[PDB]
């Protein structure tokens, strides 16, 4: 089903269709139907949710019948199905947002090791395909590690994670000294 994905720090976009193209009543509501974002005529009811502080929408677009919904500064808890019920149907986006980091913070040495941590939201079976400036295709699941870390490994690492048909790129920054 139509998923979206995020990066624990990004935004995201979620779509709502309408045939009258007219700004008719839509509401954005998560799985068990709290109110999150809703067209009340010519107005937006910031629902009573976890997202009383974040969510939004491009407002102009409504008079076109395309109603969006964004989740700014995604943290893994904003990961949940949503729903849009413009006139007689209830389009459901599904947002499974995560993020990732490495263990090493500021200090590394040549021949040492580093590991990974991907902060998935519950119910996810992803696969982490991760890269290196040296072509170290670290092939495996969550916890990616290598026993060889060298001065040639400098430069960030394009890490990626497949969660149900998509991925999103990642830094793994490498700095020495």
């Amino acid at each position: 089903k139509k998923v979206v994905l995020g990066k624990k720090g990004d935004t995201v976009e979620l779509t709502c269709t309408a045939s009258q193209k007219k700004s008719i009543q839509f509401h954005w509501k998560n799985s068990n139907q709290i109110k999150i974002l809703g067209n009340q005529g010519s107005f937006l009811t910031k629902g009573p949710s976890k997202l009383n502080d974040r969510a939004d929408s491009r407002r102009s677009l409504w008079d076109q019948g395309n109603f969006p919904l964004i989740i700014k500064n995604l943290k893994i808890e904003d990961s949940d199905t949503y729903i849009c019920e413009v006139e007689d149907q209830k389009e459901e986006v599904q947002l499974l947002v995560f993020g990732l980091t490495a263990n090493s913070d500021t200090h590394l040495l040549q021949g040492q090791s580093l590991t990974l941590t991907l902060e998935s939201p519950p119910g996810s079976s992803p696969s982490v395909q991760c890269r290196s400036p040296r072509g170290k295709n670290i092939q495996g699941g969550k916890t990616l590690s290598v026993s060889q870390l060298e001065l040639q490994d400098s430069g960030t690492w394009t890490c990626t994670v497949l969660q149900n048909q998509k991925k999103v790129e990642f830094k793994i920054d490498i700095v020495v000294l």
Binding site: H27, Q33, K35, G38, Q40
Partner: protein
């Protein structure tokens, strides 16, 4: 006049207070009450705040 949840200089209610909606499954269905009495709302500010 136009106002939000609460009006000004406007209508009153005739007999008593009643309500306007339907199904209790998900319940957006905005509810409306007409309150069969009056209330006082009055805002004054003569100058009292010359410093802008």
């Amino acid at each position: 006049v136009v106002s939000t949840q609460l009006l000004l200089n406007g209508s009153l209610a005739e007999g008593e207070i009643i309500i306007r909606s339907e199904n209790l499954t998900n319940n957006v269905k905005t509810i409306l009450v007409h309150l069969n009495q009056s209330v006082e709302i009055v805002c004054t500010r003569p100058n009292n705040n010359t410093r802008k």
